[PDB]
């Protein structure tokens, strides 16, 4: 193991907006592939259903597409058609109260989902413990 296992409470049971308290958007898988955030609560990408593969390892797939999250090999999320290595994603608790997703394929690198201030996604080297960007609630739909 490269990193903790403290887990997050809560489970799978229905599908949930990822907010980022960094600046207050909310993860979005796009149509096409690309992925952003949003303020729009009402947006239709935003509803994403996630599932556990093994305990504390997750796919975030979007309700609305059936597109999967994923890191590439350069560090940008996407969304894939078809599940992956790429897809999984260590969730565990974070400072006592969020969420946080470490991709599992480059855990060893630290690359963690993440949302800056202006909406839009952080290349996984970009991302290390201790920020913001890194930081989720998940949210009723």
């Not at 990408?45 to 599932?51: A, D, E, F, K, W």
Request: glycine share 10%; charged share 25%.
């Amino acid at each position: 193991h490269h990193h903790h296992f403290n887990l997050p409470p809560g489970n799978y049971k229905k599908p949930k907006l990822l907010y980022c308290s960094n600046g207050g958007h909310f993860l979005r898988i796009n149509p096409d592939g690309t992925v952003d955030g949003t303020r729009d609560r009402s947006d239709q990408h935003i509803q994403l259903q996630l599932s556990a593969e093994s305990v504390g390892e997750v796919y975030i797939k979007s309700t609305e597409t059936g597109q999967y999250l994923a890191m590439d090999t350069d560090g940008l999320l996407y969304g894939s058609q078809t599940p992956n290595e790429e897809c999984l994603f260590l969730e565990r608790l974070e400072e006592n109260h969020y969420n946080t997703y470490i991709s599992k394929k480059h855990a060893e690198k630290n690359w963690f989902v993440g949302l800056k201030k202006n909406g839009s996604c952080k290349r996984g080297p970009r991302t290390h413990y201790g920020q913001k960007a890194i930081l989720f609630l998940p949210l009723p739909v």
